[PDB]
Paper text:
Tripartite motif (TRIM) family proteins are RING-type E3 ligases that play key regulatory roles in innate immune signalling pathways that lead to the induction of a type I interferon (IFN) response and production of inflammatory cytokines through activation of the IRF3 and NF-κB transcription factors. Activation of RIG-I initiates a signalling cascade that depends on the E3 ligase activity of TRIM25 and induces the production of IFNs and inflammatory cytokines. An example is non-structural protein 1 (NS1) of influenza A viruses (IAV), a multifunctional virulence factor that binds many host proteins during infection, including TRIM2527–29. To understand NS1-mediated inhibition of TRIM25 activity on a molecular level we have determined crystal structures of the CC domain of TRIM25 in complex with NS1-FL and the isolated ED, and of a TRIM25 CC-PRYSPRY fragment, which includes the RIG-I-recognition domain of TRIM25.
To gain molecular insight into the interaction between NS1 and TRIM25 we determined the crystal structure of the NS1-ED/TRIM25-CC complex at 2.8 Å resolution by molecular replacement (R/Rfree = 0.20/0.22). The complex crystallised in space group C222 with three copies of each NS1-ED and TRIM25-CC monomer in the asymmetric unit. Symmetry analysis shows that each NS1-ED binds to a TRIM25-CC dimer via two separate interfaces, interface A and interface B, which bury 872 and 611 Å2, respectively, of solvent accessible surface. The biggest difference between apo TRIM25-CC and the NS1-bound state is seen in the linker connecting helix α2 to the central helix α3, which is pushed from its position in the apo TRIM25-CC structure towards helix α1 due to contacts by NS1-ED from interface A. This copy of NS1-ED makes contacts with both TRIM25 chains within the CC dimer via a highly conserved motif of NS1 that includes a short α helix comprising residues 95–99. Previous mutational analysis identified E96 and E97 in this motif as crucial for TRIM25 binding and inhibition of interferon production. Our structure now shows that the side chains of E96 and E97 point away from the binding interface with TRIM25. However, they form a network of contacts within NS1-ED, especially between the side chains of E96 and R100, which is likely important to maintain the structural integrity of this helix. Instead, L95ED of this helix is a key element of the interface and contacts a hydrophobic pocket of TRIM25 formed by residues from both chains of the CC including V223CC, F274CC, I277CC, I324CC and V327CC. This interaction is further stabilised by a hydrogen bond between the backbone of L95ED and the side chain of E326CC. Interface B involves loop-forming NS1-ED residues 139-143 that contact the central four-helical bundle of TRIM25-CC with R140ED at its centre.
Author numbering:
A (entry chain A), B (entry chain A): 190 to 362
C (entry chain B), D (entry chain B): 86 to 205
Write the structure that this text describes.
Amino acid sequence: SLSQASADLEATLRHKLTVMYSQINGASRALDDVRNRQQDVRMTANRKVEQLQQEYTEMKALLDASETTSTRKIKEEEKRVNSKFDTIYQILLKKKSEIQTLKEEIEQSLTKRDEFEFLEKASKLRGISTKPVYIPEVELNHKLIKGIHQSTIDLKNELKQCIGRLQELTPSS
Amino acid sequence: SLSQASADLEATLRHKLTVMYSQINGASRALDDVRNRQQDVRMTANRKVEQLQQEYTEMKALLDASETTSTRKIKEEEKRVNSKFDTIYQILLKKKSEIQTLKEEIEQSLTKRDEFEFLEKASKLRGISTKPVYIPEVELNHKLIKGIHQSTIDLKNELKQCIGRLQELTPSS
Amino acid sequence: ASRYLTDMTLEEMSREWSMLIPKQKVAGPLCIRMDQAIMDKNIILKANFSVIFDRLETLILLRAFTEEGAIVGEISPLPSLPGHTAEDVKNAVGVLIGGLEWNDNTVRVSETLQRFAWRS
Amino acid sequence: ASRYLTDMTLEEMSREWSMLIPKQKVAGPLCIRMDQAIMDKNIILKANFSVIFDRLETLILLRAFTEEGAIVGEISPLPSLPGHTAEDVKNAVGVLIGGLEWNDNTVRVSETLQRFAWRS
């Protein structure tokens, strides 16, 4: 009756051996499941990080636009007054040339001065006093220039406050 | 009486020649004045442009800070769930090893199976069914992740509107 | 994003007009003109202007049109082209509207001007 | 600019306390504890927390102190350290203040908490 209880045992074990492969295989498919699950959260996270970076590149480009726009305003205010000074420079230079020219004529009219004919030739030259012209004041717009800087500082402060309202929405670790 | 009117003329001209140098020199000092004036507006303008650029470098650094802070939140949400999956993986692997181990003992207990003593050695092995354990669901926080992205887009839009309020304050050319 | 808005055609921009009774004012960096002989008309203010960051940047020309298409008013930057701002434009538009409303005209502003000079 | 604020000393952070009558609640990611045997006392809420962009970032520990320096309440993040926000903190502070006001205590919040958790 004992070779029968061993046959009974052998019978129960080989059927317990088969239930064991269905659960070893079941475990292996559960392992693949979590590896695939955690691979999915990587792709999900990397894509959102990649989407964040594309937003901040747009923002950095807005700032570049604002910066070159503000420096263009300042540099065009510079060239506005510096061009008005350039027309003034050329007026004063022309006025300086008329005086330089006429003085040279007087200087070489007085080298032929003891020729009897000096008077008739030089009575014309005492009369010309071509010295006049009025120049209006040119004023660099300091308020405009300094205001661009002041409200650019304001832009930075409200950017810092904007950032703060964003990060406070989510926990940090 | 004519050599006297030439002496009179010579006299008036050499005194008119001296008034002419005081005005040629006066003109030259006025020229230096405007060159120095327009040099001053350059220095004034360049310094304000240089001050603008230092503000925008602070802003670009705020954005870098916000960006690395937001990507750190996303990557730490990723590692929160991926670590919970890793403890799950090692549970399922350990459960898989107990089953693999016990099946190997059953496999080489049934190779010495026709030895009379098989029963006494293998009645222990039908009893162990060490297969259990419950795993709670792990959930990636999509709302949090997507909200960081959504309100980062909001930050860009209010930055664009902030910039607009600045540039409208001053004329463009 | 930097756009240029054209309420007016190429011909409306170049067409010439005269005031039957001239009325002119310089309002800082802008010149305001209107015909105070125009009465009891529905007028529309059309403008060609550039826009940056979704706000008005530079006005090129603004003209007042009757329903019949005739020019009866104008707001233009001074020939010296001194800089102006959207504030200068908005105030100039208010001056010209009040000037035209004296003779019981009804003035409207183009939708482009509403969206980019004001915030409503 | 990223600062860390310490209302509490190193000893106040490590000192141990017990509730004579315990009262405990988990309020999301924070744990709120108070002794409901404390009556008719002036209490001050002190907190050690980090700040980023001039707003609260992470609470480390918040404790309620009598004028005599004894701990009678506490708000702390759960040992699992699940993330919390300034909203979670502000609500937890309101829960703990109302819990302590039941027995007619008078609760005040440190100036550091006022400047960085609220906007006033």
